[PDB]
Each structure stands twice: as C-alpha cells, then as structure tokens.
Design a protein around this ligand. Structure first.
Ligand SMILES: Nc1ncnc2c1ncn2[C@@H]1O[C@H](COP(=O)(O)OP(=O)(O)OP(=O)(O)O)[C@@H](O)[C@H]1O
Lengths: 613, 615
RNA sequence: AAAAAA
C-alpha cells in the first residue's frame, strides 16, 4: 500500500540506485542500498540530496568484503544480506527488491532473499547505451544530468519479475533475533557485520524440513505421528525394515524412544539384586523385615528353556511381595525407585497397577493408597522438567483385586471396587496422580462367577471409572467374550488366544479395545517359538487392527525392562518393522485411560521425541 | 564414479565454458551450454574440438529471445531453462551448474533452478585481469592459449557455493511430461522453445502449497483432515469464523462438502410432492397400492411453530412405507430415487436403515432384503465414476427393530436381529453393499427402555455386528446408560438427554460412541428454540466442545422435508457460533464412527480430505 | 551478457 521501500545492491556502477529509484509508479519513501566496501557512494548521496529531499538512505557496507577471492567472501555476504532485510521493519507488501549491481552471485543472492522472505515486486533495471562518453555508446554514468536525461528519453528499462509471497514464518521474524554488528558507521553510511551465520543455518533447516514434509505428505494417514513426516527418504525407508535386536544401533534407538507403559505391577519391581537391598535399607521397622530369602531363578531365567506354570512364577517374587511392603517406609522407597526406573527407561506415561489391600495389616487400605499416591505425586513434583513444566513421567493408578485366595470373595472384590470408586472422587485434579481404572482378574472364574461380576460391577460404570480385564490362564474365547461384552472392559491383559475366534477378533478391533501383551512374561509363563504353543500373536493382531501394546508386566520377576520388551517382540515375531514399534506406542496412547487434553499433550510430546538414526 | 555433467549459461562474452569445464577435481562430460539467439559459439566448439575430444558438447538457443526487453523475455527463458534441465537426464548427484555468464536475471534464474531442482555443485567462475589487449590487464576473452594460460598460471578462482538438496518430487519429474519443443537444429547447437508455461505453474504450485503447509503445521492436529492444511492464512481464518446459514456463499459451500450420512431411514423418504408420485408410477401391481392420501403436514412443516410428539411424527407420511412399499417395483424405485438424491447431495457414504420384514405376503423378508441390497448394488455399479473408479456413493444397510406399544412385536424384533446375523455374514464382499449393523428404534419408553432386549441381542454380539439405538429420543439419561452398557451400543441415536448426567457424557466421549443427531427432526419433535431466541439449548455445540463424537444426519428425508445440506445449514442457525471448522469435525466424527472396514475408512479419509472446496 | 545494468 503506502510507504514502498527499495532494496538495491550495487557494485562499481553508482548510477544503478538512481535508475531503480525512479521506477514508474514508484512513490518510494526510503531507499536502502547494499554495498561491498569498495565503490564510491558520493553520487548516490548527491542524487538523493538535490532532487530527493526525504528518501532516508541507508548504505550498508558489509565490512571485509573488498573482493570475491573465495566463497567465504560470498557466505559472509548472504548472512549480512538477510539480516539487512530484517533490520528494516518492512512487510512483504513494502519491499521492492532490485537485483542489479555487484557480482552475479551477489545479484543472485538478492533473488533468493526475496523469494524466501517475500517482496511486493522484484525487478531489474537496464540502460541502453546512450551517453556518448569518451568511447562511443556508454550507458549513463554521469551523475544526475544524464540519468534524468535517460528517463525522459525512453532509455531506462525496468524488467519486473512480479511479486513474491515468501514463506509464512520468514516475512516478519525480528531484527533482534539476528542483530547486525554495526562497526564504524558515519552519517547514513553503516558498515554492518555478522558475528555468526545462524540465519543461513536457520533458513536451510526450514527449507529442508519443508521439502521433506512435502515429499512425504502423501501418506500421513499411515504415519503414526506427524513428526515422522519431517524425515529423509532414507530414514523413512530405514524405518520400514525389520528390526534387528542384535544390532547395537537398533538397541540404542529403541532405548531412546518415548514409551507408554500400561501393564506394570507395583509389587514385582525389585525382587532381586541391589534394588532389593535398597528397599530393605529404607525401612521404618528394620526389626520386623523378614530375613533375606532371595529366590533362585530358573537356569537361563530371562529366556528359559522351558515355560514354568504361574504358581512357580509368582513365587519368584516372594522377597518383595507383601512381606517387605507392609512397612510404610519400604512402600515409599519402592515407589521412588520404580518412578526413577521409569524415567530412565524414557516412559512418558505409565499406569502402575497396585493392590493396597495386600499391604494392609495394621494400617487401613486407604492409608496404603494414600501413601502410594503421595509417593508418586511427590516424585512427579520433584522430577520437574520437560517443556511446559510437566512431569517427566505421568503415573496413574489402576487397582487390582487381591491375589489372596483365602477369605470371602464377594466382599474382597466389593472392597476393591468401593475403594476405587471413592478414590476416583477423592483425587480429581487432572494433572495429578489420579486413579483411572480397575482390574477385574480373579473375581470371575469361581463357580461361574460371571453373573455375580456382571451385576456387582455396575457401580464402576456408574461412577465413570475404566475397566481392564486380565485374562487368566488358558484364556478361552468365551472368557474373553464376556470380558468384552458382559462387563464392559476397555483393555484386555494378555489374551494371546484371540486369533482362534475370528468373529471376536473382528469385534475387538472394530470397538477399538486395547490388548496388553508383554513378551518376557508370556515367554516365561507360556513358552513361544523364539526366533525361527503357536506363534506369538503380536504381528498377526497388529495387521488385523487390534489395539495392541507391549508392556512389562512384572519387572523384577521377569528381570526385563520395557526397552527389552520391545526388542524381544522382534525375536518372538520375525517381521516387525521399526515403524511397527511406533504403532504400538500410538496404540498404547489411544487406549490409555488419560483424558483428551492429556492425550493430545502426550501425542505431541512423543511426536517430537523419536530419536532419528 | 559419477558422470559429472556440467550446466552453464553463455552471454555475449564466450570462453566462460572452457573456464567452467576447467573446474579442478572433476572430469566433466556432456557440457550443456545455454545461449540466447546471439552469442557466438565458434570459440567454445573449437576448444572442445582441440582440448576435450569427446566431452559431448550440446548447445541450446532459447526460442526467439535475443535482447532483454520485457518480463516476457525473461519468463520465456526461465521455462526453457527448466525443461532443458529435465531434458538432460540424471539427478542431483550429476549436475554441476555454473551461474556465470548471461544477464543478471539469467544468472539469478540459474541459481534458483539448482535450488528447487537439485544440484551436486553450484559455482561461479572469476577470471583475473591477467591478460592484455587494447586496454591492458584485461580478461582472457578469446583464444585457446589465454584460457589455458589462465589455468596453468592459476589466476582463476571458481568460488563454490556447495551442493543443494532439491525437492524430492522435483529431482526427476519426467522429460516426457514437459517436452521441450525443438526448432531448426544442426549438430551440437540447436534452438528450442517452450509451447506453454506448464512447468512454471507446476513449480509455483508446489512452493505455494509447501509454504502454506509449513506455516499451518504446529497446529495440524486441530485440523480434522490433513489435506485441509494447504489453505491460505485468510482461508484458514475464514474457516474459523462462525457459519452464516443466510449467506448464499456459505450455502453453496456446504452443498459442496463431501458428506457422510449415518442415520437415514428407507422407511420414510418421499411422502409428498412429485417424489411420491414417481414411486407409484413404477409399481408392477398398480391395482394393489392404496389410494392417494398424503397426511397434512402442520403449518410451515420444515420449521413448525409447535413441536409435535413422537407418535404423530411416525404417522406423518403414511402414504409411503409399510402400505406403499409392498410392490417389488415400488421397493426398487424407492432405493433408486434415494441413491440419486444422495449422490446429488454429495454424500460419499451412507448407511440406509430399513425394516425388510415389514414387507411380506409371499416375498419372504430375506427376499425383500436381497432385493434392497441388489437395488443399491446395481446403482453403485452404475454411478461408478467417483475418484479412482469407485462407486460415487457407497451405501450400507442397517436393519431396524421396531417396538411400538403392543402386539407380537418382539417376534418381529427376533426376526430382524436373526435376519441381520445371517445377511451380514452372507455378503462379505467388502466393496459391495452389505448389512453392517442393527438398530433399536420406534417408541422409546420407560416400559421398554434399552435393556429388556439384552437377552435378545446376545446372538448379534456373538456373531459380530454393530449395534445402534434410539436412546434419548424422548427418555432421560438413564435410557442412554442402559443402551451403552447393557446393549454395548456403538452409536446412540438422538442422544439429547445426555448433558444432564456428566459421568455418562464423559463415558460416551471416552469410549467413543457416536451420537447421531438430526437438527430438523429434533426441532420438529422437541421444538428447540431457533436463532438463540421450553426444551432447552441444543447440545450439538456442547458435545463438540466436550469431545463427544457427534454427527448431523437426516432421519426421514421426506417426512422432515429437509436434506442433509439443509440439516447442516440449520445446525449453525439453530446453534449460534457453530464454526465452519466444526462442520468438518462432524464429517470426521462420522467417518470414525461409521460401520465400515479399516481399509474403506482410509479410502474415505483421502476422498473427503481432497473433496473439501476452497471459498 | 566473469571482477560489479545490454
Ligand atoms: N425419527 C425417528 N425416531 C424414532 N423412531 C423412528 C423415527 N423414524 C422412524 N422411526 C421408527 O423406526 C422404524 C422405521 O420404519 P420404516 O421407515 O422402515 O418404515 P415405515 O413403514 O415408515 O414404518 P412404521 O409405519 O412402522 O413406523 C419404525 O418403527 C418407525 O416408527
């Protein structure tokens, strides 16, 4: 609109600037001149002194650019040129960039700047030979007397290349982001200088990410996250090859992924090693802790030769069962230790399962739950990091029915649900460690306890809590079927035997009900064909559309972290692409019991968290 | 190991090319000089004849452009240059451009070409003033010794600006796609001219789209469809300001959206006007159809002054339905007319609700449904243009289960639910119309709420089928809770009494049950106030803010006398502040709650994303 | 029309 500015760069031909100034339809108000620390400017100053009263010249000079010996001379020019544009607070509709003067690279740089910063008009001034001069037919060099005579004689030509819109986040920036080091500036004649070439790096990053996103924009629906669209073709191709857990490069990459944990038990964290001693070393009543009875693991335990029944499986964690956690001091220590382990693993969101009733001899179950929530809430507050001041790992609680088989069962589940329902109401802050769901494994499978569970669990749905059902031993399709439809569960633990029931598998995928697989737990309790009991159903379920996640289950009892869980899934199912591991994380995100606002934050937190190769 | 081609532009001062060819550390082949109907090339040809046996020189002359006079002169050169780049094969790893020579615009265009097209090296040749002549200390302009002396003495510089990435879709394109028309040619040198400005607009299209997609990226998730993020800043700004139903510009826009219909009844539709007459002219037993008696619609039926109740609304339009659609010709014509209506309305996916067992004297309900399915399937085969050679509109079927007041209606429910199980499993062709769900419609009452048919619906869940329900049509939130948790419903119909119970509203949003609303019918039954002028406020805008997956459907088109576009337009008029962005959320919500395979859901996602029209 | 607008 108003206040059209002019950006021109000249070499040793001073007449360029006055020629470009009187571009037909100019109405200029401030001409800016870019020089090279050689040519005289007394003519441009003279021209704009006699018949250009207010034009507000700025003659930038680019210190230390006398000649063009090497490209380092040119690179110093590009950084100065870009910062020179921003030093004048001018919009795209005000720049009338002219590319005429200086070396060809100097002029070509002016073209690039206008395209990637926006310019209302980019033109180039010509002058046919009409000044007679000493030798015949010289273009007009002779001050104002001939330049004015050139305009009215129909000599100067203005080839205009039209406007340039420029990139949406380049056409304002701010001059203070990339300041100019003024050195030795006289009246309206400044020798600018740049301390670093940050803008050149900043601009290059933006063009290449814009190129990558455009080159891979055809298939965003398949890409689990948006940030993967900013990857090179090679990296994207590398992402679709089968995972190689043997390769150290793959192992490092998986360890760096932001992960989501959904099936982790608080009572099976530190059952061996130094961690068990750490819990015992922090006890309020050291006289009452049972003697060290660390169990003996099966030969080659992390990858056992033969599967073991669940009876011997749970017995591997007696050293850290209810015996050690009845003391309130040990309970806080383990929660801190488990939280620290999760952050080291890189988990951005976890749902630690727990059963406060088991750890309640003198204190009430509510005291156990209050201590558990306080222990996690303290850690989340203390481990304050990440953008926006959000906790490094957000931990929610899911309550499990007591593993104890003695005592009345109807009341035991009644206490379980009643504790959870009031727990959800007691702690209601969204960003705090909040109880989000219940587990209903062990309440059924007792003289056809489906009917009792189908009516004594309606309170959970009425109060708004979530329900996850951990399918037990020899999970039949009917047992899963009632878990999906009779009691409205939203996640099914394990449930390996689901491919047999094709119709149920269609129903699970269609309703988007999550499935919580855990490799080492499954391998160490049921046995599966490792490398080259049927095949592990992880790959098959994912192709169908089942919301499948990879979790840890017990950590200490399995002696394997979540990072190891993802690696083993490749060994259990040869064929997992590195893209698939990212799908599992998104499936965990979209089936977690967090809220919509928290889900969006995790999605973008995970999106810009994936380590590039 | 690369072949290392060279690209260079020539002005009136030749011998640039030998200098460019003498770039240290590269054995170039197939030099590709540019000239413009003027500069001499004898010196360049001689140099390669005598000092470069087989480096395969080529020269092009760029059309009838000989003196820079207007922008059309430059624009002609630019597109000739770009095609000349493509005509030369091979990609970035081979290119060695040299922006030296020619006009300033020619040099500037050369660098831009390498930037947006890929180049292994961009350099510029500077010749020192180390030769003599009429002036003295002059350039090495001519001769063979001077250039060779320039190299051997070493007073040449070759400032190198480093390689460029180049946009991957612009690294090869295809020379055949953008041919460079060739005019009179001798050996080596030739003259070419571009017929149209095809490449310039193509490249401008990519960069313009890349700019918009880059800026509107940090907030992409707020966009329902990814393809939306290629619009101007104003267009995005215009898309967020509230919809104006009265504005003709918006009315034409909404009529252009690709819609998805989830809640539409075959029993219904044409009940007045020419549409009903058309059906009865296709009957194959004209003597059996009942006489012409179309029930009298109340005053201003599209926007009635008073809310009629549910019992009356069902009997509005009895001239079409159980009585009329008994002739097999009438049933086929109903399906044909609805499909044409849907395609004209722009719907890309519909789920027509029907009750085939309502139509049986000699034709069994299976026969009637087979005819309905065949009637739609042949229509989909007919109007099979679409994008990608698909059906124009994909129509699926949901069998209704009515429960009126009395009689042996539960046997009809038992028959519909059993029929759906057999039918859905029988027609497994993914690309063809097939029964995908059941329904629970009719008279909603506390006596027959949602859960008195839980024993009846067990078979449907076992076989695997979607289940909808009309919970909340006129009952409280408790009816909705029964439908969600005792029937395991996947889509609630007309769930208006849902905002009262906060836990249910959160539970529905968290699980993802789609709430099927319909503006005209809800205005014509519960009498919601219009234009923000007592049933209460309409919850459409409330549901979207809370995150409940909601969609705007049509119910009976003829009985409500309003199409899908009318329903969408009325929603903004009936819920003030409804942004045009929210209309796209409804389509996204409808897509993610529709009963269809994942493969089809992906296909619709791309089709709807590209179908959204700019203002 | 390469070290400085044709
Ligand atoms: N908007 C609506 N809300 C609730 N129930 C509806 C609505 N529209 C139709 N119904 C009921 O759903 C079923 C739809 O029947 P359909 O349209 O296939 O045939 P019909 O000949 O019109 O039926 P009928 O005379 O029994 O209502 C019937 O039970 C109808 O009462």
């Amino acid at each position: 609109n108003v206040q059209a500015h002019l950006f021109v760069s000249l070499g040793t031909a001073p007449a360029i600037v006055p020629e470009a100034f009187l571009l037909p339809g100019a109405r200029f108000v401030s001409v800016h001149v870019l020089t090279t620390e050689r040519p005289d400017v007394t003519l441009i100053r003279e021209f704009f002194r006699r018949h250009a009263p207010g034009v507000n010249l700025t003659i930038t000079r680019v210190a230390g650019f006398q000649d063009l010996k090497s490209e380092e001379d040119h690179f110093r020019f590009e950084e100065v040129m870009f910062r020179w544009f921003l030093a004048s607070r001018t919009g795209p509709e005000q720049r009338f960039v002219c590319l005429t003067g200086g070396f060809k690279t100097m002029s070509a740089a002016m073209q690039k700047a206008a395209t990637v910063l926006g310019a209302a008009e980019v033109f180039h001034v010509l002058a046919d030979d009409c000044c007679v001069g000493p030798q015949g037919r010289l273009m007009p060099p002779s001050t104002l007397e001939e330049i004015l005579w050139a305009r009215d004689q129909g000599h100067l030509h203005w080839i205009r290349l039209g406007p340039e819109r420029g990139w949406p986040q380049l056409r304002r920036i701010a001059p203070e982001q990339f300041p100019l080091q003024v050195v030795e500036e006289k009246g309206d004649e400044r020798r600018v200088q740049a301390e670093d070439r940050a803008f050149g790096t900043f601009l290059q990053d933006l063009l290449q990410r814009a190129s990558r996103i455009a080159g891979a924009w055809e298939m965003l629906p398949e890409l689990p996250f948006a940030d993967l669209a900013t990857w090179s073709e090679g990296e994207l191709a590398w992402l679709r090859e089968p995972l190689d857990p043997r390769a150290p490069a793959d192992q490092r990459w998986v360890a760096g992924l932001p992960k989501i944990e959904l099936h982790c038990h608080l009572g099976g964290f530190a059952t061996h090693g130094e961690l068990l001693r750490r819990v015992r070393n922090a006890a309020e009543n050291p006289g009452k802790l049972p003697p060290l009875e660390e169990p003996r693991l099966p030969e080659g335990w992390p990858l056992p030769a033969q599967p073991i029944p669940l009876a011997e499986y749970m017995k591997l964690g007696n050293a850290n069962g209810t015996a050690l956690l009845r003391d309130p001091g040990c309970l806080r220590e383990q929660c801190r230790l488990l939280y620290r382990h999760l952050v080291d693993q890189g988990v951005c969101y976890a749902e630690v399962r727990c059963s406060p009733a088991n750890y309640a001899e003198v204190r009430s179950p509510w005291d156990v739950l209050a201590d558990i929530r306080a222990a996690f809430q303290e850690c989340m507050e203390g481990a304050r990091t990440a953008p926006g001041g959000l906790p490094a790992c957000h931990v929610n609680l899911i309550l499990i029915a007591t593993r104890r088989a003695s005592g009345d069962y109807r009341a035991a589940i009644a206490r379980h649900l009643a504790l959870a329902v009031t727990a959800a109401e007691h702690w209601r802050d969204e960003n705090a460690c909040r109880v989000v769901g219940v587990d209903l494994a062990g309440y059924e499978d007792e003289k056809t306890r489906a009917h009792y569970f189908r009516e004594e669990f309606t309170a959970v749905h009425r109060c708004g809590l979530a329900v996850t059902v951990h399918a037990g031993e020899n999970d039949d399709a009917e047992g899963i079927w009632r878990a999906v439809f009779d009691l409205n569960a939203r996640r099914l633990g394990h449930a390996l035997s689901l491919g047999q029931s094709r119709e149920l598998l269609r129903s699970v995928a269609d309703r988007g009900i999550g499935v919580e697989l855990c490799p080492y737990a499954n391998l160490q309790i049921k046995g599966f064909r490792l490398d080259g009991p049927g095949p592990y159903p992880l790959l098959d379920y994912l192709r169908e559309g089942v919301r499948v996640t990879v979790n840890t289950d017990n950590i200490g009892i399995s002696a394997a972290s979540l990072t190891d869980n993802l690696l083993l899934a490749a060994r259990l199912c040869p064929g997992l692409t590195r893209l698939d591991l990212l799908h599992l994380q998104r499936h965990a995100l979209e089936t977690a019991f967090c809220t919509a606002t928290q889900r969006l934050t995790l999605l973008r937190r995970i999106s810009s968290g994936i380590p590039r190769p």
